[PDB]
Amino acid sequence: MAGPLSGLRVVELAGIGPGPHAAMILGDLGADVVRIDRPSSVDGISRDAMLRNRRIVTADLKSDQGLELALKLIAKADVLIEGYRPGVTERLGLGPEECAKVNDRLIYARMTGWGQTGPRSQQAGHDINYISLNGILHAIGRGDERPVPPLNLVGDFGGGSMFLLVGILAALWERQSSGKGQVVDAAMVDGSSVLIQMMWAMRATGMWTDTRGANMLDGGAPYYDTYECADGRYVAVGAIEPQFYAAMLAGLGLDAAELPPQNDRARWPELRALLTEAFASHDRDHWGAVFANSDACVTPVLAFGEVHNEPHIIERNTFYEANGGWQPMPAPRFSRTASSQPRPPAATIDIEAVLTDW
Amino acid sequence: MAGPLSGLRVVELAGIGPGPHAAMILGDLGADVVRIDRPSSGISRDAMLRNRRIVTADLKSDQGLELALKLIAKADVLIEGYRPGVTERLGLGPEECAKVNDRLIYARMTGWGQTGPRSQQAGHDINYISLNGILHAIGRGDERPVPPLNLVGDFGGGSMFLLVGILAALWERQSSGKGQVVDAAMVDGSSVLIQMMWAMRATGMWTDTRGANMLDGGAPYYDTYECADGRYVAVGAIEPQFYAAMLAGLGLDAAELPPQNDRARWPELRALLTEAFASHDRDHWGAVFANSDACVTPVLAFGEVHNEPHIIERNTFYEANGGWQPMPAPRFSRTASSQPRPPAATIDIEAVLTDWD
Ligand SMILES: C[C@H](C(=O)SCCNC(=O)CCNC(=O)[C@H](O)C(C)(C)COP(=O)(O)OP(=O)(O)OC[C@@H]1O[C@@H](n2cnc3c(N)ncnc32)[C@H](O)[C@@H]1OP(=O)(O)O)c1cccc(Oc2ccccc2)c1
Ligand SMILES: C[C@H](C(=O)SCCNC(=O)CCNC(=O)[C@H](O)C(C)(C)COP(=O)(O)OP(=O)(O)OC[C@@H]1O[C@@H](n2cnc3c(N)ncnc32)[C@H](O)[C@@H]1OP(=O)(O)O)c1cccc(Oc2ccccc2)c1
Numbered sequence: 001m002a003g004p005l006s007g008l009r010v011v012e013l014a015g016i017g018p019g020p021h022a023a024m025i026l027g028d029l030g031a032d033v034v035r036i037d038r039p040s041s042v043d044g045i046s047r048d049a050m051l052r053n054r055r056i057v058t059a060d061l062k063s064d065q066g067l068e069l070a071l072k073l074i075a076k077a078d079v080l081i082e083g084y085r086p087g088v089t090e091r092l093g094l095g096p097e098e099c100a101k102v103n104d105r106l107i108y109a110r111m112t113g114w115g116q117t118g119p120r121s122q123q124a125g126h127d128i129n130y131i132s133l134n135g136i137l138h139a140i141g142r143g144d145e146r147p148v149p150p151l152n153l154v155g156d157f158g159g160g161s162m163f164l165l166v167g168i169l170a171a172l173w174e175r176q177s178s179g180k181g182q183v184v185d186a187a188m189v190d191g192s193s194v195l196i197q198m199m200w201a202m203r204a205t206g207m208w209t210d211t212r213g214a215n216m217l218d219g220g221a222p223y224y225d226t227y228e229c230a231d232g233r234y235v236a237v238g239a240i241e242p243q244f245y246a247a248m249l250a251g252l253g254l255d256a257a258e259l260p261p262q263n264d265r266a267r268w269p270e271l272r273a274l275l276t277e278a279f280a281s282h283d284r285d286h287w288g289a290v291f292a293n294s295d296a297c298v299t300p301v302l303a304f305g306e307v308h309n310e311p312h313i314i315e316r317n318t319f320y321e322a323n324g325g326w327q328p329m330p331a332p333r334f335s336r337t338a339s340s341q342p343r344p345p346a347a348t349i350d351i352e353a354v355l356t357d358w
Numbered sequence: 359m360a361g362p363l364s365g366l367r368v369v370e371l372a373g374i375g376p377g378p379h380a381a382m383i384l385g386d387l388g389a390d391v392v393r394i395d396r397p398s399s400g401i402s403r404d405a406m407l408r409n410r411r412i413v414t415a416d417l418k419s420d421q422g423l424e425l426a427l428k429l430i431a432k433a434d435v436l437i438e439g440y441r442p443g444v445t446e447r448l449g450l451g452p453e454e455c456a457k458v459n460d461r462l463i464y465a466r467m468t469g470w471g472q473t474g475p476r477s478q479q480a481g482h483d484i485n486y487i488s489l490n491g492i493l494h495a496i497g498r499g500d501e502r503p504v505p506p507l508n509l510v511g512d513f514g515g516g517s518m519f520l521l522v523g524i525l526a527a528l529w530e531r532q533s534s535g536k537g538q539v540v541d542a543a544m545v546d547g548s549s550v551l552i553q554m555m556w557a558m559r560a561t562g563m564w565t566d567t568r569g570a571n572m573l574d575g576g577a578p579y580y581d582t583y584e585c586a587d588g589r590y591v592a593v594g595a596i597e598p599q600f601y602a603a604m605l606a607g608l609g610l611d612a613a614e615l616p617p618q619n620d621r622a623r624w625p626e627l628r629a630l631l632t633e634a635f636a637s638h639d640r641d642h643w644g645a646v647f648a649n650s651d652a653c654v655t656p657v658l659a660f661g662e663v664h665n666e667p668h669i670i671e672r673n674t675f676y677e678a679n680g681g682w683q684p685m686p687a688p689r690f691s692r693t694a695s696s697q698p699r700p701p702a703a704t705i706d707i708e709a710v711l712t713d714w715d
Contacts, residue, residue, distance in 0.1 A: 004530035004538075017554075025550065029526050049557035096691075108691075120668040124651035126594035127573075128580060133668065135660035137582065137592060140506050141497070146582045146590050147657055148575050150496055150506035157551045158514020162522065167688035169525030170387050174362035174693055176532055182362075186688035190674050193684035194383065195513045198375075201405040203660055204680030210659040217483075217507050224484060226493070226502045234502050236493060238482035295480035301503055303566040304491035304559055312476040313489065318546055325560025328549035331515075332523035332542035335452075337530050 002340035003030025018160035019083030027053025028330035083111035127155035143213025159192025227279035360696035361388025377439030379517035385409025483511035499569025515548025
């Protein structure tokens with residue numbers, strides 16, 4: 001099995017969102033990932049590409065046999081991932097204390113939104129709820145409108161799965177000294193708060209307000225925002241540093257003498273009006289030619305369906321095909337122990353066959 | 359040093375955005391983090407530089423480089439976030455570093471990657487997510503896309519994939535005795551970060567139309583709503599039973615409403631939910647739905663977060679200097695991280711060297 005996590009053995013109690021995204025990445029990087037679903041949802045070969053790099057097995061964990069088979073896998077594994085409400089694994093007999101009795105090397109990885117304790121710990125939720133409570137959602141979107149969710153990117157994945165992964169891998173490093181596993185408590189409300197540490201830093205020093213649409217990186221700066229072009233498509237401008245901004249103005253045909261200063265915020269209305277009219281006078285792909293190879297920090301805003309035609313995407317193999325759709329290749333990349341292309345979701349397997357193999 | 363990464367040694371060449379963020383999280387979890395900045399630069403007021411020692415050094419001088427390679431020889435990980443070719447010309451490239459330490463994890467944090475047509479282009483978060491479909495998908499349908507701050511390229515698809523790479527490569531080192539190079543590009547990371555949308559598009563469950571999807575704000579049951587006081591709630595009631603619970607708490611009879619997932623009637627459903635949420639203030643709904651599975655939460659501004667019980671009681675934040683900062687994540691039962699040490703003035707690079715033998 002290819003990649004730097006070759007050898008690593010992972011048990012995943014089937015959930016939704018961050019739990020499987022984490023499991024996928026471990027898979028992506030060479031880990032041996034075994035997913036226990038419930039047969040209650042059996043079916044044929046899954047069409048969810050997030051379940052790549054897996055072996056799937058069914059097992060009614062509510063039964064005595066289910067529980068014991070599961071506990072044999074955990075016994076022989078390095079990592080467990082579960083993303084159910086607190087108390088679910090305990091009451092199933094798969095809690096941390098029950099796992100520590102059959103394998104004190106286990107990394108016990110607990111993926112939730114609200115955490116293991118506190119008032120909201122039994123409330124159902126999704127990404128949008130977790131980022132609503134810690135200031136993040138409020139900061140996303142235009143100033144003249146209600147906040148808009150950044151898909152489920154910030155809570156489920158950036159602040160969720162990815163902190164789970166770091167916790168797992170940090171704990172595997174720990175286990176090299178101590179010879180013991182431990183419990184990783186990854187809460188989306190905490191992880192996403194560390195994801196936005198920069199804004200908490202800038203806020204402390206007067207450089208970020210709570211006003212939506214009025215900061216350097218939320219769309220309030222005319223030099224860090226998207227612009228509509230003549231064809232109704234969009235470019236992104238990220239020309240923060242004055243040298244890059246100067247390069248952008250030159251490409252737009254605007255002389256600096258005629259514009260307000262780049263960071264005179266009181267005249268950002270004028271500046272935006274000027275840049276807006278300039279970008280609107282040619283089409284996205286024009287701006288794409290003008291600015292390729294430039295430090296102007298102007299890029300086309302591509303839709304998913306167009307990404308496969310972008311030279312830089314094609315050449316670094318950021319994507320692969322698998323069943324009428326592109327999918328991202330593992331990240332990050334490794335010089336000596338390279339990941340390989342993901343294997344598609346495999347038809348189910350017998351939980352015994354797996355214990356054998358292991 | 360408290361945390362699971364006690365005894366990890368990390369050298370950080372100072373940059374902006376992802377590299378410093380990764381270095382911070384490494385520090386957070388108890389790594390020994392030494393940050394080389396350039397003298398052209400007392401105490402730094404960027405709290406992102408917590409859990410570090412800062413040293414200066416002209417990496418262009420002969421003596422700055424020599425000192426630097428003596429750190430790197432003593433360390434486990436090096437982090438750099440410059441354009442490709444830069445460390446090479448300093449004589450700090452992966453090959454020069456492998457001579458003084460073949461165990462080093464050499465961690466390269468870029469936006470566009472190490473090679474290819476855009477590899478020398480300047481850029482920021484908004485550019486990396488523009489190229490791979492992400493930015494286009496964020497915002498209302500009747501408007502131009504809105505950047506999700508720099509959360510998705512710099513951090514989610516950036517620093518966090520550098521970390522996964524640094525730590526996976528440490529695992530691999532345990533069985534091979536050898537370091538290696540980690541190439542973390544924000545355009546790659548952020549694509550994996552959004553793998554769920556690519557999965558969903560492949561099965562016809564996501565479109566390229568902005569504002570018309572389950573999770574982009576087009577669903578009336580996954581969106582924010584303005585309340586009587588001008589403040590907002592978030593609704594995330596995807597599962598039908600959570601949805602049902604929400605409708606009951608709004609005073610809405612499900613018989614009067616279009617189906618939850620009849621997309622042609624979403625405009626109409628949204629208008630009914632909009633009127634309901636508008637008839638009371640945010641804190642009213644916060645109360646009403648506490649302990650509920652309705653998936654309705656108040657949308658708090660940064661300055662209100664210190665007053666939310668769930669936040670206070672889990673110590674998600676600590677007070678520092680100007681204000682609150684996020685405590686380390688994730689959390690560890692046995693080897694628990696400690697409260698971050700503030701950014702502490704420059705020390706001399708030789709001091710560190712004696713400290714590390
Ligand atoms: C964008 C969006 C997201 O944000 S992702 C999810 C975000 N939240 C979390 O993950 C945080 C922690 N988890 C939970 O808070 C809950 O999981 C729950 C999901 C809220 C509700 O779940 P609920 O149904 O109450 O389940 P529970 O966890 O409390 O307990 C369920 C248990 O089931 C039983 N059993 C588990 N495994 C087995 C087994 N093998 N055999 C037998 N029983 C099993 C346990 O007994 C327990 O049940 P109990 O005893 O209490 O009755 C998001 C992301 C991705 C997808 C998505 O939705 C879509 C759906 C379809 C298509 C597309 C998207 C939404
Ligand atoms: C939201 C936002 C973000 O997205 S942050 C993410 C930005 N993107 C990346 O990080 C990707 C990789 N890096 C780059 O693409 C470039 O680094 C560059 C950032 C374009 C700047 O290009 P440039 O200034 O030309 O620098 P370079 O990398 O090409 O090489 C410069 C080098 O400086 C020299 N030297 C380094 N260390 C030393 C030393 N110790 N002593 C002496 N010299 C040193 C190197 O030798 C090299 O020089 P060369 O030989 O080539 O001349 C974001 C987040 C946070 C902040 C922010 O914006 C601000 C910007 C300014 C002020 C405040 C905020 C933006």
